[PDB]
Amino acid sequence: MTLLEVIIVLGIMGVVSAGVVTLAQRAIDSQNMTKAAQSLNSIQVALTQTYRGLGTADATAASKLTSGLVSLGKISSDEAKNPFIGTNMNIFSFPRNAAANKAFAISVDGLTQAQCKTLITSVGDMFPYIAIKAGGAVALADLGDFENSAAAAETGVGVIKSIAPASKNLDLTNITAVEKLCKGTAPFGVAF
Amino acid sequence: MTLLEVIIVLGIMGVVSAGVVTLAQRAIDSQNMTKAAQSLNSIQVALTQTYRGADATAASKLTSGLVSLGKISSDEAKNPFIGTNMNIFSFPRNAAANKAFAISVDGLTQAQCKTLITSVGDMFPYIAIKAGGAVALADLGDFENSAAAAETGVGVIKSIAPASKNLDLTNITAVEKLCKGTAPFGVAFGNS
Amino acid sequence: MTLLEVIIVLGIMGVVSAGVVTLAQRAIDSQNMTKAAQSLNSIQVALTQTYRADATAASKLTSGLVSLGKISSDEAKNPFIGTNMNIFSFPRNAAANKAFAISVDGLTQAQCKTLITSVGDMFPYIAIKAGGAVALADLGDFENSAAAAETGVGVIKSIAPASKNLDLTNITAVEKLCKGTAPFGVAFGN
Amino acid sequence: MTLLEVIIVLGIMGVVSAGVVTLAQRAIDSQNMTKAAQSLNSIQVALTQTYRGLGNYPATADATAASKLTSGLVSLGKISSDEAKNPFIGTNMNIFSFPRNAAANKAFAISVDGLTQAQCKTLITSVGDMFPYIAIKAGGAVALADLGDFENSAAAAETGVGVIKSIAPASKNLDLTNITAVEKLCKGTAPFGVAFGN
Amino acid sequence: TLLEVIIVLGIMGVVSAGVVTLAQRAIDSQNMTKAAQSLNSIQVALTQTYRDATAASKLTSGLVSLGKISSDEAKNPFIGTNMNIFSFPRNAAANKAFAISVDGLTQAQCKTLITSVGDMFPYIAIKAGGAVALADLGDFENSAAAAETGVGVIKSIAPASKNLDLTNITAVEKLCKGTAPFGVAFGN
Amino acid sequence: MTLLEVIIVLGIMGVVSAGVVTLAQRAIDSQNMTKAAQSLNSIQVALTQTYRGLGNYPATADATAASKLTSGLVSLGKISSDEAKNPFIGTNMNIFSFPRNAAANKAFAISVDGLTQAQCKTLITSVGDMFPYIAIKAGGAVALADLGDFENSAAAAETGVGVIKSIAPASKNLDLTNITAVEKLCKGTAPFGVAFGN
Amino acid sequence: MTLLEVIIVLGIMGVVSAGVVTLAQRAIDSQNMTKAAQSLNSIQVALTQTYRGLADATAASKLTSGLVSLGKISSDEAKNPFIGTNMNIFSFPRNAAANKAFAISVDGLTQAQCKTLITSVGDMFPYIAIKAGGAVALADLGDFENSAAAAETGVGVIKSIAPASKNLDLTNITAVEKLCKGTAPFGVAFGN
Amino acid sequence: MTLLEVIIVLGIMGVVSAGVVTLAQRAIDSQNMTKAAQSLNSIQVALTQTYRGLGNYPATADATAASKLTSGLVSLGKISSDEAKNPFIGTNMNIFSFPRNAAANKAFAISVDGLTQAQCKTLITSVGDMFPYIAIKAGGAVALADLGDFENSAAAAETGVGVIKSIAPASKNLDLTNITAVEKLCKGTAPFGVAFGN
Amino acid sequence: TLLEVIIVLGIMGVVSAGVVTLAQRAIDSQNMTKAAQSLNSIQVALTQTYRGLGDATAASKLTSGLVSLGKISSDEAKNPFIGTNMNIFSFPRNAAANKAFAISVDGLTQAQCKTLITSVGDMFPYIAIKAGGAVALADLGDFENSAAAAETGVGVIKSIAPASKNLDLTNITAVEKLCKGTAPFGVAFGN
């Protein structure tokens, strides 16, 4: 019976239960991804139901507009908080096709490289306009035009996805689009 | 295996079934507001059919008469936020009584007030806000003589007479000022 | 081998068994907490869908809501002590009888801590009554009370913006959860 | 009481010590196979969750491109290195992409190389039911040319080479209640490279 | 003959000594397994609900208070004292990572714990002749690991780092060089 | 490691399996009730479109002829077969008439009979107050003479068998907030025969 | 050690393996019980979701295989875990109305298995019949509505909807002791 | 304890982890089936309400023209980029125009890709009620010549292959509710192709 | 000879008998582990099933019924030391009839009593001891109103009463003065 209990514990008993932490991390990150997807869908439907009448300047005005949309009752309060920091999402506006204040931007600040890649690969379909700021929060100058800004996905910075007829749109079947995606330095600033 | 079982039971199954009741809150609020939107337009079309060609007690008796007249079903005549019929107010159009009418909804919270002013109101030229309780007959200013300013926060907010300004959905000051003050709030929708 | 060596590796199995038994106790406590969370969420959803006084009235309302088929049978009894949960109709922001609070009473201190940590997000209003059971006069309004977490007794989460909402990264107030004597009436309202 | 003691010691101690390592070999192999199947099912789930929601899969060119694509995908956070660590060679597994019904970028195949004969048979009889397309390459790593078309396969279990399990009607599949199917299975030379495709 | 029972008892004594030594080794292995299970449950509990030595003591007391971790789980099976859990900066972000710091280890206990929980944590730090201090730890995602010093951060998650090896005997011999009490930190 | 898998199959795997089943039963019963509500609305609107405008509601004879009238309305194609097939027994409704102030053949009543006492509560709730006239018959069935007029039958609470809510000026109608209302309704035992008149 | 020590030790080596065998038996039993409960619930839902608006054991097996083919139930749950083959659903008359009621037949169980399956899945069926000491047959299925219950017998009909049936008390330990009386193999027919 | 019990509990964890792949497979299959159910109705409604007033339909005699017709229908806004995708293969379906009443190009046919036997029976039992004509082929997908006449071809539901539900005078009455007809569906070789004629 | 035979047979007899007691001790430790796991399983089954609902022969009947229900196995019900099934006693707590229960094991000596206590008693908030025989249904007082003075060794030694002085299994002087009396002993664990 002896010389068997030692290996029986020191192998199986420890190693069979050690692999759970990775799956717990993945489960928490996937829960946050689903919450972020639901929040982005809610913000998009609120935008196409409120700003559709064809009507912010800085981070302060962005927070003001976010808190107003919260107080408006158009979106639920908790769904306005970021699933990464817990604070209200940054909402900006930028000209669309050289027409000032015609497009909208949803800026999620304080993202790591892994978070950047995961969230963008998750929700790349909902927004034709997607931008990244490596090591910096999103601002008014960072946002280009919705159509007059060409995308160069080789660097994975700035406007990576757009509908301009020069944009290297993100591909889910290109390895260079995987490796170069969200390149730079943290904190990454993703704007939808 | 009991490890990661503690978490498949705790959180991963408890967080998913959390916040959906807030989404259910929003759904029920919008549904009550949905039929309420189609409960005001019916009165609008009926009164524009009838009268286009007084006090609170007279207001209530006229409302009950319009209900009993068969021009409106008891369902649409009932205010879903209160539990009774909505307040109908016939007000003069350039000192001409019975040539204009206004419908007042009272007993709503600031959140319900803002949501209702957003979801309805853009079908009625005259809009007023009486906070702290029911609206008075004197508060129902003449439509063609009224002047409006969304920054006032209390009183008339929208009119067509060439001395007014209307609501903006990109102005945080316009948002926060919507029926700001003490409860209950009362909002009037006026028509000729 | 010698019976000495055989009995040497015979209590090691007992130690592993005691460890796994403690782990199972913890897991079953967590399962009871999950049951409680699901029951509370179901009560909240049913109350919000169907609609829109004292402890005896609360028990009568609970029995009526069970008979109306809005909830299952076990969704009324206490997930810990098996008593019918109290559903109180208490005023909200100077408006009477426009707020509902589910009162799970008779908990221990560990029950306090774990149930609060489980349902901190399901309900926007959390209250703690110590030294016994909750009351209607004990519970304030939904918005007329500034929640205080450093006290460890009373309201710990309210929607009134004049309070500081309790969070899990705060260790001080969490250390003082259900400070007092048993029982511990804990009310969650929406 | 001298011959007695020596006989008891030799006999019983030897016979009790012998079986320990023999059954511990089986235990270690079983736990390795278990974690391998878990990680492989995790890779399959991640790939059919992320890249099947679109409808296509990235293109591979060779073993280098396959390994680079695997490293890129695992770096993305969809999976972890602990889940991509091949428990038979310690490095990462290979992920190739081949056409399904002659439509490129539609079929994928996770290939693991470095198995012995017994390891080949064990891994097959343990996981082959999960994946509808099972292929074998004896004495070599699985390449892109070694993977034929999805439904144009003609798997022959008695050969033990190439594809063995196919959903195509032009072939049969491994039957766990047939000793002739398994005795001819994993018939060749090491290192074996097994490919599980979807 | 009388010499028969003499050699019988002689040959019994060596088996007795061997089984006592093997029982001692088994006791050490059981203690190490209990420690590993406690550390794993600590990791798992901290993953949920969250995603100097005074702060660590307060944190473990609050966690055993909330029932998230058992009392036996927090007490080190080698000293009977609450294992200090330190929050330390990660990638220039302060107090967003967590490391379990255990103290009261010998060198054999050090080797055993490291070799047992190497697969358990992607971050390993050693403090020779003392306990892990709050300032002892650096950044969690940028500090390069020192795979040869046998002390400090030897297993780090930074890409520039080079983790520990379990196949080279010299690497195993280089493990955990210093004096007691040893303080070892496992972060994630 | 053993006795752990056992108290995992029984610890949570046993209890969470029964918990899902109960909620699944509740969800399926609620879906059947919502289908019955949709059926009620469809039959209501179809009848109030076809046999309306003129003062001719089809002359209702004894219960068998009421079932025949229902079958004829189905055969006419104005209502779908499943809509007129109750989701509780799989039979056809009983489309009775009601003398609207001693005026026979001037009203219509969709009768759903043969249900348990528990079903009565949610049945009243599921359709709510869409039907103005509400009636129930406990421990039996509903016929033409089994109920009074449409606008003269007084509504009350303790009634049980009889009227609950009517357009008549009899106050204290159906209200979900009154605990005495939801208590006294559906008093008795099956067969509960409820009548939704309009 | 004197060859008696070793014999004693080897005697203590057989009790450990027998305990492992018994624990594996219990684990298999619990897994099969969970599988059987879930499958019974799913099959009842499938049958009462497509046949509510509308022979021998061989015909029962044929119709079960067709229901698996119908896509209402899967192949894994259709197989009774205790026997390794597909379950049987008997089309028996409901108050002399053939093909209007069903009863799922489970066979090959003993006293403990029958009792556990009953106390676990009794609530989901309004008819409980247990044929003790043999297989099942179409004859053993009386009218679902006209047959009375026999609780004290511990065999056959114990739960029925007839107005004079012996009302089943699931949680009554007295009736629990009287459950699944007779010999093995038992056949449990859950009717509806 | 011992080490064989470790192997036992490892194999039990392996079984409980092998159940989840079948669970997820059935889930994703039910999802694809539910999507195809509405896709068939969308295709039928669009094709009817668009090209019924023109008498004839665009002549397609190969997969290329049919796929281009599907792309044109997507461009016409009658269907979207997600509705036109066949959830089994992954790409757009094949919409052929097949003869009717001895005259060619008078009706249209919706041909699915390669389906299995479970897919056969699920799809047909769920969708065939919304289509007058049904044809099933084994091996490859239904071809052009395989598409018989809409009104001038008898059916054969006992063989499972060929015409399974037609409206010719000699067509056997298809009892889509009797399990005896269901058990005789596409009894042949996989994959299978199904064409809904309307 | 005369020297060798007698002394060698005596020494062989001494060394032969020295292992039977050790085998008995090993079997007793196995029985202790089995009983601890069985008591844990019975506690789990009871607190899950008979919480929202609520003599010797009756106790054995409840034990056999719980075995029949499948929540507990047949193995984990047989009292290993006596081969019978463990008693399950129903008794009120704070005048709440049948809302409390206590599983009773009987037929133990002092060493078995102390070992079983110090092993399993940390799970149950109620421990009682009866000496000389089995725990009678009347011997079990209130689950909550019973003050616990562990110095007695027989009677209420662990409870949740405000005046109850809880045990200390680590304390040596407590366990040394525990379970005092005459064997066989009976110990009840309650919830």
Give contacts of D59 with chain A, Cβ < 8 Å: 173
Q: What are the chain I neighbours of G109 within 8 Å (beta carbons)?
A: none
* Domains held by chain A: number: 1
With 0-12 / 13-18 / 19 or more C-beta atoms within 10 angstroms meaning exposed / middle / buried, residue D147 is buried
Given a contact cutoff of 8 angstroms between Cβ atoms, the answer to whether F108 and G79 are in contact is no
Contacts for C144-152 with beta carbons within 8 Å, 24 or more apart?
C144/C93, C144/C94, C149/C173, C150/C176, C151/C176, C152/C128, C152/C176, C152/C177, C152/C178, C152/C179, C152/C180
Q: Which residues contact I41 (CB under 8 A, 6 or more apart)?
A: F7, I72, I73, I76
For the stretch B144-180, what's the b/e string if a residue is b when 16 or more beta carbons lie within 10 angstroms of its beta carbon?
A: bebebbbeebbbbbbbeeeebebbebebbebbbbbbb
Chains A and E, touching by 3 or more CB pairs within 8 angstroms: yes
Task: Give the residue on H whose Cα is nearest the Cα of A7.
Answer: H3
CB neighbour burial string for I77-103, b if at least 16 within 10 angstroms, e if fewer: bbbbbeebbbbbbbbbbeeeeebbbbb
Q: Which two tokens stand for residue D198?
A: 């979807």
Q: DSSP letter at I156?
A: E
Residue C76 CA, chain-centre distance (Å), reads: 13
Nearest CA in chain C to E28: C12
Give the H or E element holding residue A99.
strand A99-111
Residue at token pair 């995790």: D42
String of b and e for G127-157 (b: at least 16 CB within 10 Å)?
A: bbbbbbeeebeeebbbbbbebebebeebbbb
CA distances from A159 to A97, A115, A122, A179 (A): 15, 18, 17, 17
Identify any residues that bridge with E185 across adjacent strands, giving them in sequence order.
Answer: E101, E125
The pair of three-digit structure tokens given for residue F68, joined into one six-digit string:
């025949």
User: B24 to chain A nearest CA, in Å?
Assistant: 11
Asked whether H160 and H136 are in contact (CB, 8 A), the reply is yes
Nearest residue to A77 via CA among A47, A42, A49, A104: A42
DSSP characters over chain C: --HHHHHHTTSHHHHHHHHHHHHHHHHHHHHHHHHHHHHHHHHHHHHHHH----HHHHHHHHHHHHHTTSS-STTTB-TTT-PBPEEEE--BTTBTT--EEEEE-S--HHHHHHHHHHHTTT-SEEEEEESB---TTTS--SSS----STTSSEEEE-S-TTS----TT--HHHHTTT-S-S-EEEEEE-
HSE toward the beta carbon, residue H49, CA cutoff 13 A: 11
Task: Give the F-side interface with I, CB within 8 Å.
Answer: 3, 7, 10-11, 15
Residues of chain B with Cβ-Cβ distance to F5 below 8 Å are: 1
Which H/E stretch holds residue H19?
Answer: helix H4-51
Name the phi and psi angles at I58, rounded to 5.
-65, -40
Q: Is I11:E5 a contact under the CB 8 Å cutoff?
A: yes
Contact H97, H108 (CB under 8 A): yes
Helices and strands of chain E, counted as H and E runs: 5, 5
- Distance between F151 CA and the closest CA of chain B, angstroms: 16
Cα I87 from Cα I104, distance rounded (Å):
5
Contact G77, G38 (CB under 8 A): yes
CB A156 within 8 A of CB A104: no
CA distance B59 to B137: 10
Separation in Å, CA A140 to CA A90, B151, D33, I23:
11, 27, 54, 82
Strand E123-127, strand E152-155: pairing: antiparallel
- DSSP string over A47-79: HHHHGGGT---SHHHHHHHHHHHHHTTSS-SGG
Residue ranges of chain E whose CB lies within 8 Å of a chain D CB = 4-5, 7-8, 11, 15
According to DSSP, the β-strands at B101-108 and B87-90 are antiparallel
Q: Which residue of F has its CA nearest to A11?
A: F1
The torsion region of residue I25 among left (phi > 0), alpha (psi -120 to 50) and beta comes to: alpha
Phi, psi of C129 (to 5 degrees): -110, 125
Cα I43 from Cα I191, distance rounded (Å): 8
Q: Report the C-alpha gap between F40 and F95 in whole angstroms.
A: 11
Strand partners, F92: F85
Cβ-contact G39, H151 below 8 angstroms: no
I with A: touching (≥3 Cβ pairs within 8 Å): no
Examine chains C and G and say if they touch (3+ CB pairs below 8 A): yes
Question: Hey, CA dihedral for H174, H175, H177, H178, is it positive or negative?
Answer: negative
Q: Which residue of A has its CA nearest to B13?
A: A31
Measured CA to CA, the distance from residue H29 to residue H121 in angstroms comes to 13
- In chain C, whose CA is at the least distance from the CA of F24? C72
Whether the CB-CB separation of E95 and E89 falls below 8 Å is answered with yes
Question: How far is it between the farthest Cα atoms of chain G?
Answer: 79
Q: Show the CA angle centred on residue F35, arms to residues C50 and G93, nearest 5°.
A: 120
CB within 8 Å of E1: residues ≥ 6 apart: I4
Here the tokens at position E17 are 């000594």
Per the entry, the structure determination technique was: cryo-EM
Give the list of residues 6+ apart from residue I73 with CB closer than 8 angstroms, or none. Answer: G22, G26, I41, I67
Reported structure resolution in angstroms: 3.8
**What distance in Å separates the CA atoms of residue F134 and residue F166, rounded to the nearest whole number?**
7
- Residue pairs between chains E and I whose CB atoms are closer than 8 Å: 5
> How close is the nearest chain H Cα to the Cα of A23, in Å?
14
C-alpha of H185 from chain center: 13
Q: Give the integer Cα–Cα distance in Å for B97 and A105.
A: 49
Residues I38 and I56: their CA atoms lie apart, in Å, by 19
Residue B189 — φ and ψ, nearest 5°? -115, 115
Q: Which two tokens stand for residue F38?
A: 């949709």
Distance CA F52, CA D32 (A): 76
**Cβ distance B54 to C75 under 8 Å?**
no
Nearest-angstrom CA–CA distance, C37 and A8: 38
DSSP 8-state symbol, E143: P
Q: Which two tokens stand for residue D119?
A: 């390891």
Contacts of A3 in chain E (CB under 8 A): 22
Pick the closest to residue E188 from E105, E85, E49 (CA basis).
E85
Backbone angles phi and psi of D110, in degrees to 5: -90, 115
Determine the Cα angle at E104 with ends E103 and E105, to 5°.
Answer: 100
Nearest chain E alpha carbon to I4? E1
Torsion-angle region of residue B95: left (phi > 0), alpha (psi -120 to 50) or beta? left
CA distance C55 to C139: 12
Partners of H95 in the β-ladder:
H110
Give the CA diameter of chain E: 81
Cα–Cα distance measured from residue E104 to residue E113, given in angstroms and rounded to the nearest whole number? 12
Q: How far apart are CA H115 and CA H134, in angstroms?
A: 15
D-chain residues near H12 (CB < 8 A): none
Identify the residue whose tokens are 């082959």. Answer: D128
Place of tokens 């008795």: F188
Cross-chain Cβ contact C68/F11 below 8 Å: no
| Residues in CB range of F47: below 8 A, 6 or more apart | F73, F78, F95, F108
Q: Which long-range contacts (CB under 8 A, 24 or more apart) does I77-81 make?
A: I77/I38, I77/I42, I79/I35, I79/I105, I79/I106, I79/I107, I80/I31, I80/I34, I80/I35, I81/I31, I81/I35, I81/I105, I81/I107, I81/I108, I81/I112
Nearest residue of A to residue D75, measured between CA atoms: A114
Looking at the domain assignment, is residue F153 inside a domain?
yes
Return d(Cα C39, Cα C72) in angstroms, integer. 9
Interface contact flag, C51 F177, Cβ < 8 Å: yes
Three-class SS state of G86: strand
3-state secondary structure of D71: helix
Please give the full DSSP string across B32-67, using - where no structure is assigned: HHHHHHHHHHHHHHHHHHHTT---HHHHHHHHHHHH
Distance from CA of H5 to the nearest CA of F (A): 7
CA distance A124 to chain B (A): 23
Return the H-helix or E-strand segment holding A104: strand A99-111
H or E element, residue D13: none
Rg of chain E over CA atoms, in angstroms? 20
Q: Can you read off the two tokens belonging to residue I82? A: 């006596």
F176 vs C50, C60, C61: nearest CB:
C50
Secondary structure of I71-130 in the HEC alphabet?
Answer: CCCCHHHECCCCCCECEEEEECCCCCCCCEEEEEEEEECHHHHHHHHHHHCCCCCEEEEE
Give which of G178, G42, G18, G61 is closest to G121, Cα–Cα.
Answer: G42
Residues 6 or more apart in contact with residue E110 via CB below 8 angstroms: E126, E175, E176, E182, E184
Q: Do residues H118 and G69 lie in contact, with contact meaning Cβ atoms separated by under 8 Å?
A: yes
Q: Which two tokens stand for residue D80?
A: 């972890």
Query: Residue C180 — left, alpha, or beta (φ > 0 → left; ψ -120 to 50 → alpha)?
Result: left
Query: Tokens representing D47?
Result: 């790939």
Q: Please report the beta strands in chain D, taking only residues with DSSP state E, as ranges in sequence order.
A: 94-100, 103-115, 133-137, 162-165, 192-197
Pairing of strands C125-130, C100-104: unpaired
Q: Bridge partners of I165?
A: I149
Q: In the structure, do chain C and chain A come into contact, i.e. share 3 or more CB pairs under 8 Å?
A: yes
Residue C187: strand pairing partners: C103, C127
* Beta carbons of H18 and D129 less than 8 Å apart: yes
From chain G, the residues in CB contact with D4 under 8 A are 2-3
Output phi, psi for G172, to 5 deg: -80, 115
For residue G62, which phi and psi values (nearest 5 degrees)?
-60, -45
3-state helix, strand, coil in chain I (%, to 5): 40, 15, 45
Residues in A whose CB is inside 8 Å of some CB of F read: 12-13, 16
Q: Residue F76 belongs to what domain range?
A: 6-197
Measured at the alpha carbon of residue D22, what is the angle toward residues D18 and D26, in degrees to the nearest 5? Answer: 160
CB-count burial class (<10 Å; 0-12, 13-18, 19+) for H144: middle
Which amino acid is residue I2, in one-letter code? L
Chain I, nearest residue to G26 by Cα: I73
**A154: in domain:** yes
D-contacting chains (≥3 CB pairs under 8 Å): A, E, G, H
- Measure the CA dihedral A159/A160/A165/A169, to 10°: -160
- The CB-side HSE value for D78 (13 A sphere, CA atoms) comes to 22
**Which residues, in sequence order, are CB contacts of D189 under 8 Å at separation 6+?**
D138, D139
- CATH number, domain of G123, equals 3.30.1690.10
